[PDB]
From a paper:
A glycosylated region near the base of the third variable loop (V3) of HIV-1 Env forms a supersite of vulnerability that is targeted by antibodies originating from diverse germline genes in multiple HIV-1 infected individuals. Here, we determine structures of antibodies in complex with HIV-1 Envelope for all observed members and ancestral states of the broadly neutralizing HIV-1 V3-glycan targeting DH270 antibody clonal B cell lineage. Here we used cryo-EM to visualize the interactions of a complete inferred DH270 clonal tree with the co-evolving virus Env.
The I4 clade leads to mature antibodies DH270.2 and DH270.3. The most notable mutation in DH270.3 was the light chain Y27S reversion. A clear shift in the position of the N301-glycan was observed relative to the I4 intermediate. A cluster of mutations, including an improbable VH G110Y mutation, occurs in and around the DH270.3 LCDR3, near the contact between a loop adjacent to the V3 GDIK motif and the N301-glycan GlcNac base. Additional mutations, F93S, A94T, G95N, and S97A, result in remodeling of the N301-glycan interaction, shifting the position of the LCDR1 Y32 side chain for interaction with the first N301-GlcNac and interaction of N95 with the second N301-GlcNac. While DH270.3 acquires several mutations critical for neutralization, including G110Y and S94A, the selection of the Y27S reversion may have limited its breadth. The greater breadth of the DH270.2 antibody compared to DH270.3 is likely a combined effect of improvement in the N332-glycan interaction in DH270.2 and the Y27S reversion in DH270.3.
Author numbering:
A (entry chain A): 32 to 139, 150 to 185, 185A, 185B, 186 to 309, 312 to 321, 321C, 322 to 354, ...
B (entry chain B), C (entry chain L), D (entry chain G): 520 to 547, 569 to 662
E (entry chain K): 194 to 244
Write the structure that this text describes.
């Protein structure tokens, strides 16, 4: 059959391929000022239209871990923040010897903040005057081996210099939509019982991703999205115990924090035409920062995780164990709330041992029961080798942080004496793993409109 | 029909209404240098594909009838089976070897055939 | 005739010598990134317009006779007076409602008509 | 045949296989803002050249037959001599004067010639 | 008088101030029109216009 080959334009064929994506944010942010919030400045106004559409007969493979779209997210957001800390004051005169009081409180039932003083460059560069400021303890270190106990150092000048964050920018995460150029398309996986790899038996073309909240975290996944029907647990390979297992949660668990201290801001003029802000006297009494969770709901949620970790290691029972320890930045749950940065020692949430059976919440002994302590830092080395410093200025008043837990980051721990109660831990990790928990549904493809098939036309000269 | 209302669909359905997948090469707006890098868009993709599609004599973003002969050594699945049953999204994966030969055959035949226009009106 | 030597002129004068207004889509020189965004210029506008004009079967930057039936419910001013008396800069403002329907009618007619071509030499 | 496999060659050889020289308007990748200016590429050159080539009725990147009369006062070297012996790289140097007049003649003839189709179809 | 509100920068001597004319000018696809009626009250129709 002497058929003549033809060519078609507009063919539906996919090729998984790499590309950049546009960061886009909701409309209401764009009447505001520059960098307020940052999503109004470096990201485009968005549009939910058109509606996501199902591809009726398809079968497409997804690989959550091998995806690199999250890496484009990571690089873009870091470059975004780096540009945000150019137009602010680079501190500098405050890396001096700080004379600090040494009275001590010594009586317990209290944990306090240290009072310090320093000499400053006013509107005359050939004059210095006296100032004082309250500094949270981690930000200040002893000065020298020469044991003058009153002479203390700001933690900088050992590794880097620092920049104050301008008050005109705030940290509340505006939602972002990582969005495709024309000629590319975003495909969304619609299987809820999805193990993270293999074929998604239901797939849809989507204009671009639903709102991502880039909420900073290190030990737990705050405000976000929850599972359709139950807990789903994901990891690349349980053979290597060193990899980070991600657990999603179906029902939310609620967390609320508070800084009951009433800090007051003190304005200091540091160099020509630029100001530094510190903490003045604390109004009222001194109290401890804390976060609360309801313990029957936490226990139930943890047991529901337990019946999903037992699935892969049936002969071995479950034990949740305290964090790794060592560095504070690893062995603590840290996050951002109200512009301040909390650092929680969280051994209290993750002590127990689960045994497959269901130890129930009912009957409730006390419905008002809860499980409840965190430190605060201003000098933040927020990513390694990024221009690490950010000096978070104090905020006035007090704050609360009512929020939802939607997943855990864990370490599966190696064996010991072949014990039936082989254990699990909370696990700090990269911020890429934080955002990999929320873009699993998506992949990127490149459309190929030109293809060839046999028609039955003949041709004319 | 949407941007991909025929992915995994049959030849008959997917070859009618080709336009819906051809129009959407128009988007993009400002975000720094990398965006304007990211605007290859139609600006390169469409120009490339249209240059190929015109060099072969098919100046049209739709079905076009070329003349190069389909061959025994490239097909090997029954002719009548393909146009009723299969999808593009499994046909391109079976034909993917012989793209480069066809992409030269289609243009050398065009140069061969437009030459006879010079004689047939001289 | 200049860049706009027919604005407010009658149909006959403005429909002949359309080229003078079609060619002025080439310009631009460096004033940084904000200017280089300004080079969407012809690079996007001309390609959008030509994509539309080719999807309707009219691969030509001039008068092209499509077949879609003009209707009683879109015209309502007498036929003969339009082509002698009136200018584009008021015709567009009479007709501006029904652009989108027409823009789909012309392409579905093309997809219809090239299909019969596919059979008429098969 | 390579990017310039006919430079200084006879007209017959250089007028066949024009495609090899037409296709090589696709390259270029990132080096800063100056490179992003440097990629005018097809994106301006090809759009310009194809706009001229289509405004003259020749929507094809190959030999096209226009109608404008070659003249005694532009040629002055024997007709049979040129096509067999000479090369483009010395023909353009003799015809370089009358480009601008031909570039308007070719388009006004095209506008003149599409009109007779418009009214005949009417 | 500085240092009460901001810092300051000396103007380089290699740049001088006297205003050179500028022609704010259109891209292709856009066009600039000019209103040729001198008795024009800032609004309303320009009954003579030029491209
Ligand atoms: C962190 O440490 C810094 C120091 O390093 C603390 O800052 C010091 O705070 C004190 C208290 O405010 C301040 O001393 C007062 O300054 C006032 C300025 O107006 C003075 O008027 C006042 O004088 C009275 O108190 C003295 C005792 O402190 C008396 O000896 C003196 O005679 C005055 O008393 C007479 O006048 C009052 C007027 O109200 C009258 O009622 C009395 O009857 C009497 O007739 C104080 O000297 C220091 O100046 C501050 N130091 C600096 C460097 O600024 C800071 O408070 C610490 N932070 C915290 C949270 O505690
Ligand atoms: C800063 O701290 C103060 C005091 O610690 C907070 O004020 C208190 O806020 C709570 C709400 O969070 C108020 O509770 C109210 O209780 C009544 C009880 O009948 C109830 O009807 C309301 O629904 C509400 O829950 C409380 O009245 C209020 N004041 C005190 C003295 O407790 C303040 O909210 C904190 N601000 C921030 C930004 O953290």
């Amino acid at each position: 059959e002497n058929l003549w080959v033809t060519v078609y334009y507009g063919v539906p064929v996919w090729k998984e391929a790499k590309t950049t994506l546009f960061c886009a944010s909701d409309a209401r942010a764009y009447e505001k000022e520059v960098h307020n919030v940052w999503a109004t400045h470096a990201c485009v106004p968005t549009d939910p239209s058109p509606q996501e559409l199902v591809l009726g007969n398809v079968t497409e493979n997804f690989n959550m871990w091998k995806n690199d779209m999250v890496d484009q997210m990571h690089e873009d957001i870091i470059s975004l923040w780096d540009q945000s800390l150019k137009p602010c004051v680079k501190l500098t005169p405050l890396c001096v010897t700080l004379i600090c009081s040494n009275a001590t409180v010594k009586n317990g039932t209290v944990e306090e903040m240290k009072n310090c003083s320093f000499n400053t460059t006013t509107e005359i560069r050939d004059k210095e005057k006296k100032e004082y400021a309250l500094f949270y303890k981690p930000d200040i270190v002893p000065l020298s081996e020469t044991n003058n106990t009153s002479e203390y150092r700001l933690i900088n000048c050992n590794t880097s210099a620092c920049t104050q964050a301008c008050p005109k920018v705030t940290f509340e995460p505006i939602p972002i939509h990582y969005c495709a150029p024309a000629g590319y398309a975003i495909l969304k996986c619609n299987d809820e019982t999805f193990n993270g790899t293999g074929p998604c038996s239901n797939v849809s073309t989507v204009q671009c991703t639903h709102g991502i909240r880039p909420v900073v975290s290190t030990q737990l996944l705050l405000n976000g999205s929850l599972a359709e029907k139950e807990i789903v647990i994901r990891s690349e390979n349980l053979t290597n115990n060193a990899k980070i297992i991600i657990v999603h949660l179906h029902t939310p668990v609620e967390i609320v924090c508070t800084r009951p201290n009433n800090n007051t801001r003190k304005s200091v003029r540091i160099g020509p035409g630029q100001t530094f802000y510190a903490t003045g006297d604390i109004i009222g009494d001194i109290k401890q920062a804390h976060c609360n969770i309801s313990e029957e709901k936490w226990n139930d949620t943890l047991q529901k995780v337990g019946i999903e970790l037992q699935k892969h290691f049936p002969n071995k029972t479950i034990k949740y164990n305290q964090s790794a320890g060592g560095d504070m930045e690893i062995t603590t749950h840290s996050f951002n709330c109200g512009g301040e940065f909390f650092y929680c020692n969280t051994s209290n949430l993750f002590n127990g041992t689960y045994n497959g059976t269901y130890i129930s919440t009912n009957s409730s002994a006390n419905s008002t029961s809860t499980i409840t302590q965190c430190r605060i830092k201003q000098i933040i080395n927020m990513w390694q080798g990024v221009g690490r410093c950010m000096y978070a200025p104090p905020i006035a008043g007090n704050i609360t942080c009512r929020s939802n837990i939607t997943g855990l980051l864990l370490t599966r721990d190696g064996g010991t004496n072949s014990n039936e109660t082989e254990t699990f831990r909370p696990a700090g990790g990269d911020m890429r793993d934080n955002w990999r928990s929320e873009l699993y549904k998506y992949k990127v493809v490149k459309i190929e409109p030109l293809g060839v098939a046999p028609t039955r036309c003949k041709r004319r000269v | 029909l949407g941007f991909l209302g025929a992915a995994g669909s049959t030849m008959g359905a997917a070859s009618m209404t080709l336009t819906v997948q051809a129009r959407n090469l128009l988007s993009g707006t400002v975000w720094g240098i990398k965006q304007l890098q990211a605007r290859v868009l139609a600006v390169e993709r469409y120009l490339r594909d249209q240059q190929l599609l015109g060099i072969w004599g098919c100046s049209g973003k739709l079905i076009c009838c070329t003349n190069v002969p389909w061959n025994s050594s490239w097909s090997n699945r029954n002719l009548s089976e393909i146009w009723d049953n299969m999808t593009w999204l499994q046909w391109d994966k079976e034909i993917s070897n012989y793209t480069q030969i066809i992409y030269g055959l289609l243009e050398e035949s065009q140069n061969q055939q437009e030459k006879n226009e010079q004689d047939l009106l001289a």
